[PDB]
């Protein structure tokens, strides 16, 4: 729509089949380090286990994917409450300036306005983004299980061309932002800038 | 001339038939993977060799 909220989201699988591939962690915007998937799911409102597995794996008979997910739950068992997960994420975020609520507000802001921005401005994010993150992890595991091949960059359908329209659009967005900031500077500087 | 064009066409058709027979063998799982190569690489090697022989 114009803000573009450009912030890459990455879900990573660690080690290897005989190594830290056991666990899965994700990177959030404006967060110091990555976090395991299960803590994020609990922060989004999916408290019980299984339900998180409902979101991630769409077929219980697919026992291999749940085997791969085992260590994620074995690592997330520590956190059990939504506010606890939000505290964890916010605390990992940055310095503990918000001592009162333990950075709950910061984590809420990040997970509402910067986590998967192409869905935002909606308290239903709790469920929508949770489902989309489950889809992300499902794709990751499917690739890791050799069910599907590695995604190809060269596919011409995965690319877009910025013709005169979008290029002038971003350029003019920057210039108009500069102009509005200058107008605001004149407002703040000059009392009764209204007429001037 | 015409006769050599027909001979070339027969050569290419024989190569195509050999490639088809190899494909049928591979799809029936009867093909034996060449040592040092899995089934797919052996099949591709055989097909490319046949086509190159046909061109030559």
């Amino acid at each position: 729509k114009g803000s573009r909220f450009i912030s890459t989201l990455q879900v990573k699988l660690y080690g290897r089949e005989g190594s830290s591939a056991r666990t899965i962690k994700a990177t959030l915007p404006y967060i110091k380090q990555d976090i395991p998937i299960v803590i994020i799911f609990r922060a989004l409102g999916i408290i019980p286990d299984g339900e998180i597995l409902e979101h991630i794996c769409y077929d219980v008979n697919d026992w291999q994917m749940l085997e791969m997910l085992k260590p994620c739950v074995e690592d997330g068992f520590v956190i059990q409450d939504r506010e606890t997960a939000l505290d964890f994420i916010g605390r990992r975020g940055t310095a503990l300036g918000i001592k009162k609520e333990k950075r709950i507000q910061y984590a809420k802001d990040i997970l509402q306005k910067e986590f998967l921005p192409h869905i935002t401005q909606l308290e239903g994010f709790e469920s929508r983004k949770a489902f989309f993150l489950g889809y992300m992890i499902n794709r990751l595991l499917l690739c890791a299980l050799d069910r599907k091949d590695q995604d190809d960059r060269d596919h011409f359908g995965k690319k877009r061309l910025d013709l005169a329209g979008p290029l002038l659009a971003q350029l003019f967005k920057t210039l108009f932002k500069k102009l509005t900031k200058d107008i605001f500077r004149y407002m703040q500087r000059t009392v009764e800038e209204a007429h001037d | 001339d015409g006769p050599t064009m027909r001979e070339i066409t027969e050569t290419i058709a024989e190569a195509k038939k050999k490639v088809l027979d190899v494909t049928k063998e591979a799809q029936a799982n009867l093909l034996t993977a060449k040592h040092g190569m899995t089934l797919r690489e052996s099949f591709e090697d055989n097909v490319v060799r046949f086509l190159n022989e046909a061109r030559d």
Partner: protein, 98 residues
């Protein structure tokens, strides 16, 4: 529409041929409307000054008027170009190539 403001202060409709010959950018002005809502100081001791609603009560909006943001360069034959609607008999009348 595309225009040029001469050094003499007289604005004149600009066409691509003159733009190319005179080294003038082919562009058209950007005019926008700017609402001007003024909330005069309320000077109401108490929580009223803590409420911006009381400032809203002091609302006094004046005329906006078209404000000249700048000039947007315009590509030729675009909907705003002078040549977009020109026919063949006009394309070479303006010394432009059909």
């Amino acid at each position: 529409k595309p225009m040029v403001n001469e050094s003499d202060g007289v604005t004149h409709a600009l066409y691509p041929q003159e733009a190319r010959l005179r080294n003038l950018t082919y562009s058209s002005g950007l005019f926008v409307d700017v609402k001007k809502r003024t909330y005069e100081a309320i000077d109401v001791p108490g929580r009223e000054l803590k409420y911006e609603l009381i400032a809203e009560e002091s609302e006094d909006d004046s005329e906006s008027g078209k404000v000249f943001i700048g000039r947007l360069p315009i590509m030729l034959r675009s909907k705003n170009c002078y040549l977009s609607e020109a026919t063949e008999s006009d394309l070479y009348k303006l010394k432009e190539c059909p």
